[PDB]
Amino acid sequence: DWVPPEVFDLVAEDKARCMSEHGTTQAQIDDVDKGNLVNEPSITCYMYCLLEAFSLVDDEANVDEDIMLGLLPDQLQERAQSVMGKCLPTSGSDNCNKIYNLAKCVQESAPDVWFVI
Numbered sequence: 001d002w003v004p005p006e007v008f009d010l011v012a013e014d015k016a017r018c019m020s021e022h023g024t025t026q027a028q029i030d031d032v033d034k035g036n037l038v039n040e041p042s043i044t045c046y047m048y049c050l051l052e053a054f055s056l057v058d059d060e061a062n063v064d065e066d067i068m069l070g071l072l073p074d075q076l077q078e079r080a081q082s083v084m085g086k087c088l089p090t091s092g093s094d095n096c097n098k099i100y101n102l103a104k105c106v107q108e109s110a111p112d113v114w115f116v117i
């Protein structure tokens with residue numbers, strides 16, 4: 001990752017709250033970061049919950065492209081713009097399913113740009 005140690009202190013209160021709400025284990029978060037995505041609410045509602053905590057998504061899992069881009073380092077923004085060209089709009093049966101399809105889409109197309117923690 002390009003995510004610096006500090007960012008783990010930042011999202012700590014929100015990460016812990018998002019894991020309680022959805023029954024998420026740390027092993028599930030590690031599976032996402034090794035490219036092993038499964039359509040399970042405890043992991044995909046966690047992803048939605050974290051994104052929602054940092055205003056990357058609204059109430060129907062529509063992504064805010066400018067906020068999502070400004071979180072990435074400058075170096076990846078060209079490639080992230082192209083990935084976002086492909087993977088947006090979001091799509092799915094509910095918010096958790098939308099973030100699932102987004103994650104699978106972003107990972108398939110460019111592992112570097114996907115922000116789960």
Ligand SMILES: [Cl-]
Nearest residue numbers: 039044096097
């Ligand atoms: Cl799902």
